[PDB]
Single-chain antibody, 237 residues
Framework: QVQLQESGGDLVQPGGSLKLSCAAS????????MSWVRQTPDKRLELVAT????????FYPDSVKGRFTISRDNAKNTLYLQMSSLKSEDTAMYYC??????????????????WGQGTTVTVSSSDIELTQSPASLAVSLGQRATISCRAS??????????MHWYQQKPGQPPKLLIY???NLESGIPARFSGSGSRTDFTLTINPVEADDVAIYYC?????????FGGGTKLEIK
């Protein structure tokens, strides 16, 4: 019964302000770091703000730093995003997402285990780059699908790789499949497997079923900002 639910999206003019809210339920909100991640019309995912569990420390990528403020009211189990000086580039679906850093060990980096359904914002008229290949593939039922992600620099530290894989279907947020390159998320079928290290990672789906038609995203958490690859669309031939 973990739920996140965003509100506040609207049509805004350039230069305008807008405040988004994300209301959490079904867990101890103060125990978890949180982020806002937006999905632009080109289907890219971009972290725009992140906050620690106690709300005292915050991080923003260069794209939005100085314009956006993330905050949390732990008593009200709510996350906020105050947006100002809005620009065309800010038009996107905005998601809040919960950070999970598990198992926990020295240097361990987290990933997103829960997402809200998103709220739409429309503005009227040295980051690590992850490149996926192929951008699109079609396979027959029962075949393997092999999706590659290459990072611009290594995403390894402490003997481990902080690369994760998500699945996204239409109308839905991303869903975590694989964390830290090779660990299968609870509830995810064993036909999904991840491999790789340093700069070179692979998601293998074998055998593919019709339920696996989706866009698949890699994401690194070895450095801030956390960054996502551009997605790979899987269809059935």
């Amino acid at each position: 019964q973990v739920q996140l639910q965003e509100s506040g999206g609207d049509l805004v003019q350039p230069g305008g302000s807008l405040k988004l809210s994300c209301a959490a339920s079904g867990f101890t909100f103060s125990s978890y770091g949180m982020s806002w991640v937006r999905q632009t019309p080109d289907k890219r995912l971009e972290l725009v703000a992140t906050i620690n569990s106690n709300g005292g420390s915050t991080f923003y990528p260069d794209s939005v730093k100085g314009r956006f403020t993330i905050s949390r009211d732990n008593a009200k189990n709510t996350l906020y995003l105050q947006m100002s000086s809005l620009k065309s580039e800010d038009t996107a679906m905005y998601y809040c997402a919960r950070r999970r850093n598990y198992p926990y060990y020295y240097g361990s980096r987290g990933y997103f285990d829960y997402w809200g359904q998103g709220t739409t914002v429309t503005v009227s008229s040295s980051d690590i780059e992850l490149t996926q290949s192929p951008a699109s593939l079609a396979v027959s039922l029962g075949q393997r699908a092999t999706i590659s992600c290459r990072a611009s620099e290594s995403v390894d530290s402490y003997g481990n790789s902080f690369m994760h894989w998500y699945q996204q279907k239409p109308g839905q947020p991303p869903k975590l499949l694989i964390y830290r390159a090779l660990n299968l998320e609870s509830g995810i079928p064993a036909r999904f497997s991840g491999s790789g290290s340093r700069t070179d990672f692979t998601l293998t789906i074998n055998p593919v079923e019709a339920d696996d038609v989706a866009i698949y995203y890699c994401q690194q958490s070895n450095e801030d900002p956390w960054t996502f690859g551009g997605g790979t669309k899987l269809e059935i031939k």
